[PDB]
């Protein structure tokens, strides 16, 4: 059977990658009126910030997106068997949280260069 909303937590990365639609579908799902509106607006704002990054990186329509940025062993030197089979996503997030900002900057730069190259090729 299926797992519930965060039911994949605790499973390994290689298992959890197959439940991405489970988690994706729960995003967006007097005074007290104000309090409730703030809660709803906030959910939308967070959703959009993530979509914006996927847009910039060229992953706007995908749950799994492969890019052209190489992995740097300085961020992590673990082998694939260890990462995908003996770790959970929570553990992984902790391990590389210090390099997240760097990676994101690289993804933005790579996509921008790719768009320019496509524009030039289509002009031939």
């Amino acid at each position: 059977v299926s797992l519930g909303f965060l039911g994949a937590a605790g499973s390994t990365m290689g298992a959890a990658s197959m439940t991405l639609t489970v988690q994706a579908r729960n995003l967006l799902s007097t005074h007290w009126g104000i309090k409730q509106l703030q809660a709803r607006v906030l959910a939308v704002e967070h959703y959009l910030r993530d979509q914006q990054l996927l847009g910039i990186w060229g992953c706007s329509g995908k749950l799994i997106c492969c890019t052209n940025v190489p992995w740097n062993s300085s961020w992590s030197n673990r082998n694939l068997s260890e990462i995908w089979d003996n770790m959970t996503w929570l553990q992984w997030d902790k391990e590389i949280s210090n390099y997240t900002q760097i990676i994101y900057g690289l993804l933005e730069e790579s996509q921008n260069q790719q768009e320019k190259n496509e524009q030039d090729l289509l002009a031939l």
Binding site: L6, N26, R40, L63, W71, L90
Partner: protein
């Protein structure tokens, strides 16, 4: 030679504070302002997830506290103000049929009250409990005329607690600790995810926690720092202790207009004998309950330590007695009859005398007093003691005896007791990992 791959919908989270909303399913909690609950609430078990919880740093408690006070105040806005009652009262003792449990507790007061027309006055007689009335020099005034306005609570609005469910907004989740005997601060090896908490009854009391959850197996001693004598100790019981409270005097309630659609309610008379309010606790049950509590305290204080209980140390009734709302009346019960024993390695009951007070300053605020109108008839309520709030007194260079006393009065402790198992986290669905896929 690996490449970066982006994944969205990754099952990870991080600690967060946010705004939670109320779900509930006439009263002071304005439950019509809450949403319907999920008729088929989900809970999912997270295998192999260990999370750290800290009930003493749990923001949900602070937020619940603020919501309760705000709901409380809103319920008093569209009500009769009693400003016209700050007059000199002429008062004598009620001596008609006194059983000497209440000798001098009631006073028979009279005063010149306003009427529907501003050019007319009326003489009114009413009874008060000598807590609400203070002598000014037979001349008395109401106790709060020199600090606050007094508002009459609306007679149509109930004070009976209704379970409230707190729900996270989309993008957030509430993690629940299912570890039996969890003390609130360590790692929790068994957790589940819910969107809404169970219903929590906003019961307001001191010293003894009424109508809460029970420990799954054994009494649980929870504290922020057990060796710090400045902290309160919350005790969760694994069995209820039944308490039977009553206000035996049969009251006749009168009502007058004091202005244009402004009605004031008061006790006119008492039909039978005048007896003190009181609560009954089964003696055997209480003695077993303490034995269990003491055993668990020994685990922190020593197998050769003498554990004694004593009554509260002093201060205002709001902290020295056990206060609660019974049938709508406000009781202040003396618990020295419960906390009186020394522990060293039938079918009767303990009777706790109680006082009744009508002018109440809640949430330890000054400037906002409520007048609780009297209730017609005779009141009886039965409730469960599910936990205790204790403090550890004194200190020593070296001693073999510890003394515990009833404590509390800080309402966040009651809510902390029920919310100890819940944590709020933010879902962080976007992340990266290496792989062999390039493009």
């Amino acid at each position: 030679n690996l490449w970066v791959t982006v994944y969205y919908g990754v099952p990870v989270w991080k600690d967060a504070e946010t705004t939670l909303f109320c779900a509930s399913d006439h009263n002071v909690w304005a439950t019509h302002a809450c949403v319907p609950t999920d008729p088929n609430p989900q809970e999912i078990h997270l295998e192999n997830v260990t999370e750290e919880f800290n009930m003493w740093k749990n923001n949900m408690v602070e937020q619940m506290h603020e919501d309760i006070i705000s709901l409380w105040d809103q319920s008093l806005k569209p009500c009769v103000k009693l400003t016209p009652l700050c007059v000199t009262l002429q008062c004598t003792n009620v001596t008609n049929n006194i059983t000497d449990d209440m000798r001098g507790e009631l006073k028979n007061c009279s005063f010149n009250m306003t009427t529907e027309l501003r050019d007319k006055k009326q003489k009114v007689y009413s009874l008060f409990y000598r807590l609400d009335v203070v002598q000014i020099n037979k001349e008395y005034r109401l106790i709060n005329c020199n600090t606050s306005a007094i508002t009459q609570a609306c007679p149509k609005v109930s004070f009976e607690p209704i379970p409230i469910h707190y729900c996270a907004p989309a993008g957030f989740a509430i993690l629940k600790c299912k570890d039996k005997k969890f003390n609130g601060t360590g790692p929790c090896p068994s957790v589940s995810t819910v969107q809404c908490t169970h219903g929590i009854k906003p019961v307001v009391s001191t010293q003894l926690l009424l109508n809460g959850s029970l420990a799954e197996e054994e009494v649980i001693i929870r504290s922020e720092n057990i060796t710090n004598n400045a902290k309160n100790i919350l005790v969760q019981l694994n069995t209820p202790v039944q308490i039977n409270c009553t206000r035996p005097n049969n009251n006749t309630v009168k009502s007058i207009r004091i202005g244009p659609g402004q009605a004031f309610y008061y006790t006119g008379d008492i039909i039978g004998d005048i007896r003190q309010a009181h609560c009954n606790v089964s003696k055997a049950t209480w003695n077993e309950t303490l034995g269990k509590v003491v055993k668990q305290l020994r685990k922190h204080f020593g197998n050769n330590t003498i554990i004694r209980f004593a009554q509260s140390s002093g201060g205002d009734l709001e902290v020295t007695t056990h206060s609660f709302n019974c049938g709508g009346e406000f009781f202040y019960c003396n618990t020295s009859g419960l906390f009186n024993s020394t522990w060293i390695s039938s079918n009767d009951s303990i009777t706790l005398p109680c006082r009744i007070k009508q002018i109440i300053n809640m949430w330890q605020r000054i400037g906002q007093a409520m007048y609780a109108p009297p209730i017609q008839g005779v009141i009886r309520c039965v409730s469960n003691i599910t936990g205790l709030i204790l403090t550890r007194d004194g200190g020593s260079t070296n001693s073999t005896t510890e003394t515990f006393r009833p404590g509390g009065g800080d309402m966040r402790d009651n809510w902390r007791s029920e919310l100890y198992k819940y944590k709020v986290v933010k879902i962080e669905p976007l992340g990266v990992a290496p792989t062999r896929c390039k493009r």
